[PDB]
Amino acid sequence: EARSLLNPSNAPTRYAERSVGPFSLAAIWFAMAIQVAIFIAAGQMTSSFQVWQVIVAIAAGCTIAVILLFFTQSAAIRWGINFTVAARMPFGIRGSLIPITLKALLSLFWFGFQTWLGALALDEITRLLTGFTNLPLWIVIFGAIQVVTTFYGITFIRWMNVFASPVLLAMGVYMVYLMLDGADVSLGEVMSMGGENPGMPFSTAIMIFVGGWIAVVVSIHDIVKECKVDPNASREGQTKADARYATAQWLGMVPASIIFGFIGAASMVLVGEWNPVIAITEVVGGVSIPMAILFQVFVLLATWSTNPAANLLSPAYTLCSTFPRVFTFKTGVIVSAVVGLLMMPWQFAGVLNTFLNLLASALGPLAGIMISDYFLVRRRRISLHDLYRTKGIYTYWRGVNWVALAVYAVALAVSFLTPDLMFVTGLIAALLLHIPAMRWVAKTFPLFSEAESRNEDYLRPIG
Ligand SMILES: [Hg+2]
Ligand code: NA
């Protein structure tokens, strides 16, 4: 009858195997939010609003991201499953491969972009000690270092981000000090220096910060399937569990991204550049070789706390989980970091900036259909047995659910009627159409299964 798709890497993650509680998850989100993108974003916003408003658009954009997390993360915590595996539910066991390929492409692209910034940094550090300046060699060596620390999966991420967090927070508070002092300006003064060219709606501002988390929010499964759960909660104890985790991510990502957003904005407004390295250099009138090396140790420490967890984890699990007898987790990581780099993406980001903003916001229906299938349609009632099997209640028409790929198409179109909010309209649209679409497919294929009684077999302790 049915081929088995289970292997030790892509198997649900047992209660006894879980290792990330609520404080640690905040400490991962604190180090995961400090990274280049937010200097650029918050810097360019000072053109349309003043610095204090940029801080508010950031806190607001941070908060909408968490309300979405509360919903997209809930199934992964309870049942210990993948992103790639969980998509099998609404789209087919094979039909899921379409949107997931969309998503694995973004992730792989950005992995090579950030691998690049890391290389620039190590390369700046070496030639400021040796005049030696080879970049392509330093690219590879870094791609390589990340791969080897990612082999330890969430064990490394979590220990590395907990020790990085405080170092980064201090390197950052010193940074604000060097600036304010050297420009001779109080904090309150800089807080209103922007916004001399209004025009952009404040709503579209918030949407620019949320649009930086999208791809991570649409697939946290790959991190949070590792969080601690009490199997014996209730509808209401499970809900507080969901809420306690969403709260931990909030206290982690807000104060981190508010402090560093402010640094990017201040640079623009004091000196005309979003990059604090340059801006502090001017304001202070040159700096010693040590304190320079510092700036570069920072950039490197900030990339390592973001790249692996956000960009490399998820294509790894897609490989070892679609070709389960061909790839394993450790092996999928090696193939992803290689494909990522042979796209040599650091040369098309300039061009493609606008193309990629489209591809990202075209995951709105993907997030919308998955929240709806699991919460509204199935009522949290799922069958692990069938997710790991070629022929079961998730096979639909020969592996693909054409009605769901249709709800996807229709919703992406409706999405275009509202360009500055594309992502959020497509999600809301996909969410609502899936309901009637799914009560129709259900007349032909069943929505629940008997084998769902083996669910606890996958998780509980063996002996
Ligand atoms: Hg944010
Ligand atoms: Na980081």
For residue 36, the CA-to-ligand 2 centroid distance in Å is 8
Cα–Cα distance for residue pair 101/97, rounded to 1 Å: 6
For ligand 2, the distance from its centroid to the CA atom of residue 258, given in whole angstroms, is 14
If you measure from the C-alpha of residue 223 to the centroid of ligand 2, how many angstroms do you get, rounded to a whole number?
Answer: 16
Ligand nearest to the CA of residue 298, numbered in listed order: 2
Rounded to the nearest angstrom, the distance between the alpha carbon of 211 and the centre of ligand 1 is: 9
Ligand nearest to the CA of 303: 2
Tokens of 8: 């030790």
Residue 213 Cα, ligand 1 centroid: separation in angstroms?
7
Paired tokens of 293:
């090396």
CB 450 within 8 A of CB 386: no
Q: What are phi and psi of 20, to 5 degrees?
A: -115, 110
Q: Tokens for 125, please give them.
A: 């550090």
Dist. CA 308 → ligand 2 center (Å): 10
b/e burial code for range 408-444 (CB count within 10 A of at least 16 → b): bebbbebbeeeeebbbbbbbbbbbebbeebbeebeee
CA angle 265, 270, 276 (to 5 degrees): 60
Is 45 within 8 Å of 54 (Cβ atoms)? yes
* Interatomic CA distance for residues 133 and 130, integer angstroms: 8
Residues 6 or more apart from 68 whose CB is under 8 A from it? 217, 367
CA 208 to ligand 1 center in whole angstroms: 10
Q: Is 389 helix (H, G, I), strand (E, B) or coil?
A: strand
Q: 321 C-alpha to center of ligand 1: Å? A: 31
Q: How far is CA 2 from the centre of its chain?
A: 34
**Alpha helices for 131-213 (secondary structure H):** 135-150, 153-183, 187-190, 202-210
| Residues 286, 306: Cα–Cα separation, whole Å | 30
Q: Which pair of structure tokens corresponds to residue 4?
A: 């088995």
The range of the structural domain enclosing residue 231 comes to 1-463
Helix (H, G, I), strand (E, B) or coil at 274: coil
CA 357 to centroid of ligand 2, rounded, Å: 21
The gap between the terminal CA atoms of the chain, to the nearest Å, is: 29
Distance 85 CA to ligand 2 centre (A): 27
**Which pairs with CB-CB distance under 8 Å and at least 24 residues apart come from 186-190?**
190/51, 190/266, 190/269, 190/270
Distance CA 225, CA 262 (A): 33
CA of 253 to the centre of ligand 1 (A): 6
Closest CA to 96 of 404, 429, 415, 335: 404
Q: How far apart are the CA of 69 and the centre of ligand 1, in A?
A: 12
Q: Describe the crossing of helices 51-72 and 364-372 by its angle, rounded to 10 degrees.
A: 40
Ligand approaching nearest to the C-alpha of 304:
2
Measure the CA–CA gap between 270 and 273, rounded to whole angstroms: 8
Distance, CA of 344 to CA of 253 (rounded, Å): 30
- Please tell me the distance between residue 168's alpha carbon and the centre of ligand 2 in angstroms: 9
Distance of CA 453 from the midpoint of ligand 2 (Å): 42
Q: Residue 59: nearest ligand to its CA? A: 1
Task: Tell me the CA–centroid distance for residue 398 and ligand 1, in Å.
Answer: 41
CA-based nearest residue to 21, from 219, 166, 224: 224
H/E run at residue 47: none
Number of domains in the chain: 1
Between the CA of 176 and the centroid of ligand 2 the distance, in Å, is 18
Q: What 3-state class would DSSP assign to 6?
A: coil
Q: For the chain, percent helix, then strand, then coil, each to nearest 5?
A: 70, 0, 25
Tokens at 215, concatenated: 């791809």
- Joined together, the tokens standing for residue 277 give 């390295």
CA of 66 to the centre of ligand 1 (A): 9
Technique behind the model: X-ray
Counting ligands in written order, the one closest to the CA of 64 is: 1
Q: What spacing in Å lies between the alpha carbon of 71 and ligand 1's midpoint?
A: 17
Closest CA to 301 of 67, 134, 95, 145: 145
Phi and psi, residue 413, nearest 5°: -60, -65
Contact 313, 150 (CB under 8 A): yes
Q: Which ligand is nearest to the CA of 302?
A: 2
Cα 244 to ligand 2 centroid, rounded to whole Å: 23
447 Cα to the center of ligand 1, angstroms: 37
Output the domain CATH number for residue 329: 1.10.4160.10
Q: What are the φ and ψ backbone dihedral angles of 137, each rounded to 5 degrees?
A: -60, -40
